[PDB]
């Protein structure tokens, strides 16, 4: 799968959230997952997230056709780690998930181009 280069707070975000804290979106989300398959993992996080906005759906819609071949469990197990965490925190899961909506973008772009 792939997107293109083509596709307001800015990164002044760290004035408001301690950059030294744990994030939902981080290195561990990608453990065991090959380069060629990162955009597909990053689609799953996009589609969990929205589904549980305008800019986001423009990127999502395009990735309907994005899949891999063979078993994707090594991917879904990583995504499920995020979902479990974005629920176990309840309110805070939602808000923390909502709070990193931009990291989801930086990661999406970077994997899909």
């Amino acid at each position, epitope marked *: 799968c792939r997107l293109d280069k083509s596709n307001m707070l800015a990164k*002044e975000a*760290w004035n408001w959230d301690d950059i*030294t804290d744990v994030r939902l979106i981080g290195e561990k989300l990608f453990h065991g997952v090959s380069m060629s398959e990162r955009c597909y993992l990053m689609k799953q996080v996009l589609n969990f997230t929205l589904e549980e906005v305008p800019f986001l759906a423009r990127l999502s819609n395009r990735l309907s056709t994005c899949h891999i071949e063979g078993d994707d469990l090594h991917i879904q197990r990583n995504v499920q780690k995020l979902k479990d965490t974005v629920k176990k925190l309840g309110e805070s899961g939602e808000i923390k998930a909502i709070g990193e909506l931009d990291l989801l973008f930086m990661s999406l772009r970077n994997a899909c181009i």
Partner: antibody
Amino acid sequence: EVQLLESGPGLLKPSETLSLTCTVSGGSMINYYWSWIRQPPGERPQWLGHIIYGGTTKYNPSLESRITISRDISKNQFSLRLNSVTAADTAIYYCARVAIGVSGFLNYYYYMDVWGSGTAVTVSS
Amino acid sequence: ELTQSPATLSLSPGERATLSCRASQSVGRNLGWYQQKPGQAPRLLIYDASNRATGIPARFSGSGSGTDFTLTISSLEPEDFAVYYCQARLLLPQTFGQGTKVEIKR
């Protein structure tokens, strides 16, 4: 050039409250973190805590129950309070500006890039 | 955590000095080195493994990545005999390494 000037008392008695202020000149407090560091005699520098522009703090857990860090953006100051001092708190205390940002694989950098000249704090009866 | 070697380095002026820092887990390239002379505040020397901080002269250089890092002073001047500390991210309880003291050999 950005300059940080610590201000605090040189001498305290046990059980007093230490309080120190740093005045930031020649730069702004937005887009940096602001830290307190101390260096006990004979030791390496030790990080006490930081504060971000928004007011969230993080503290060294070993001082956690005694330490407060605050900031006053309209004055370009930030402050340290440490309760119930003993001889164990004797050290040179430094304020430091922290440069932070994203780097590596979804990670960060953190450098104490501008330091005050330090204020010696002795606790003694 | 960060391990500096050696505790003390005894060298002659004009000599080249090489200091090591090893991290127990990767810090990528986000390591810094600081200099402190006696009486004075520490000072940032090198950041992101190899970039000279403001005002730092050309004889100071650094390299490494992951876990293994090196600070080089290509020709020691009188003013360079001091303690050097490494630091990477916000590591607790010890944010700084133990330090390497660069002493004049005679």
